[PDB]
Amino acid sequence: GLASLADFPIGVAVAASGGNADIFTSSARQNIVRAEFNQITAENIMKMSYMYSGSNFSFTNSDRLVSWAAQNGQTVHGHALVWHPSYQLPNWASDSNANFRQDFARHIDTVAAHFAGQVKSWDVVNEALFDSADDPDGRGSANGYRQSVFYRQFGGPEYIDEAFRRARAADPTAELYYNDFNTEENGAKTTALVNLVQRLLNNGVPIDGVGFQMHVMNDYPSIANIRQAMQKIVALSPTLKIKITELDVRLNNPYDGNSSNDYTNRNDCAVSCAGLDRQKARYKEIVQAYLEVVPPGRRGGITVWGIADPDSWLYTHQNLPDWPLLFNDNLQPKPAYQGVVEALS
Template identity: 45%
Template sequence: MTSGWRGNGNGNTGITYNSDGVSFNASGDDIGAVTDIAAPIQLEDAIITMVVNVSSEFKASGANLQPFAQIKGGSWAGEWNCWAGNELFTAGTDVTITCTVAEADKKFDQTASDVQIGVQAKTSPTGVVTIKSVTVTLKQSASSSSSVASSSATSVYSANVNSLRELATFPIGAAVSNTDSPTYNILTNASEKTVVEKHFDQMTAGNIMKMSYLQPTQGNFSFTNADAFVDYAVSKNINIHGHALLWHSDYQVPGFMKNWSGSAADFITAVETHVSTIVDHYEAKGGVVSWDVVNEALNDNSPSNFRTDSAFYTKSGNSAVYIEKAFQAARAANPNVTLYYNDYNIDQNNAKTTKLVEMLTDFQARSIPIDGVGFQMHVFMDYPSIASISAAMKKVVDKGLKVKITELDVAVNNPYSGGWPGSKISTFTQDVALTQKKRYCEIVKAYLDTVPANLRGGITVWGTTDASTWLTTATSQYNGEAIAWPLLFDNNYNDKPALRGFADALQGNTCTNL
């Protein structure tokens, strides 16, 4: 950039062109730099993307940056809802910030006036800001690609989130794969590594720490892949939430347990041996800070009860005693690891939630060791309500137990709604992306509002990119279509607005679909 820029704001000393771009001295509030875009221009819903670099003085001052757009001519209105907080910046490091021009009265949907776009320093700034590049991506026409992540080869959406984990005082996690999904293997996929190491301080193994992987035949334990997974995490200062010691799903129960022909007492001993061996191994190894001890042991009936179609239930003598025995074995193996019961649909504050609380009350009355509850939170844009989510979490909080969101994803399409398939969303548009952004924000905000700091076990998203989501194949109503778009990053590991929504809640910002 060698021309077309000028200083902006009262007291501005002007701009300087250099080999990096255009710089200004951030000597006061609203000081910045702007450039013009001549009419006619339809700037409504455009995305302004800037690569900026700040000096050590600017970073130390705690100042922020505000990208903006403004119609030229006196004190004309502009887009002032954009923000890039100081936490996003590291002195001397390029950072991408964005601003979406989205005014309620469509004031930028015009052709009569020139506009100016730029960035200004806020909140008692000092130091130097350098603008290294600017891209304006106009709203796409109906005939063009609908992806909000990229509308040209050089323009990619940025959520302006330097590191999600740095915004929280509790674990921010992601479920990842190893040998169970070679394409997305955290140990070999460089893009997967980059996203995980940047944003998360906890990992969950999608499959390889489940029973059929760790003890495929009785007495024969296989730790190679899980150990490599844990070793990688520890080397990056990332800890592990273990998932899951016991799970009823047929393909994850080893044959020797499904086909057990011995006594119920001996089966319980086998369960205890599995749990204690795994927990012992990872206590000695280090890196695993918590476990889903038992996963999905309750059914979805009303009233809800224990899942009687589980091999663990039937082989324990048609009894749910295996649940408490697993918790007792885990606690005996490691007195310090955090122990969770994990399940889906308990966020709906329904009959299943009622049964969960009944089980927790019974465990506490009999001193069965349990530290918290994992809310899977595979939810939709429209269901369940935030009120239901909050009420369900509050019931666990009232028991004095930790609450952990263990498997969060927000599917765009809800195939269980009354309007399906007529309500199916076939294209991931900008409006859909921004609605999802608000939904992520509201969920995280509900967690922060409901769960006190000492009981926050953390939030884990179930995957990294939309390309690897389990929902495409697990949701039969989707017929194999990739129409969930449920995660924080797109198929190419680019930020989605959902990431910005997650960060907004952590930073105490208002949840909006702008």
């Protein structure tokens, strides 16, 4: 399948929290992963709070998934050491906690050391950049940075340098990624990414690569913008790796000022519609831009953000159905799957 077409990881996000998408329980999903992919990212269960039972570390459920990957031909991309959303914050990660920096170091040291040579790569820090459309903390932009509890407790972005350094000491074999979304738009957040990254390289911070989420729509951003965004990063260093971490492709755009081109019914694109054909071309042109802009030896992987459309976070979004992935509600390849094969080939 897909993995055989590339010399770098071709990954998928897997669910492990019950219900239909559960990788342990869905032997049909297992067989797609075994046939098509060679790396897994935990969709949720390696997020920060999942490392804890109250205040003790607890790795039973995540060790389960990593041991599954190992026996099923998959490396694992660890997602994620440091990330802000309150639902996944350990209980220590509070403005009130005066031992915050200590508990922050023990987290990185303990988790990275625990998975030492069982995980290929980490999102060491995820989503550190201010995003106008996504600021739950409310605080607005601090020089390009999100003012999350980590920023607030460290007084600045130096929690980023510290997470890299600590992870690198704890596991000297792990590929260490900075990961974020909307940095492919080639706008203000892409510029903040380049400055973020230049600063870490200037400081001697051990970062191995930059992760682009790539949660895109069929027709936005344009690929010239995605191309340029990636080019700008590849230019920063002779060595720095580029990984597409979270690739999914929305047929619907609710931000384009045009409600007349929206698919509003679940039946619209269950078998055949123009949007599925554009989706084949859109997956194709992104994987092409990747191969063209990212030299061999610096390709960290392409990962798609789930197995089958009904598993997707976006199978609904903005009160609109969508069909964002390579496999359809029946676990059958979509024209999207072909676009990726044609690009990789």
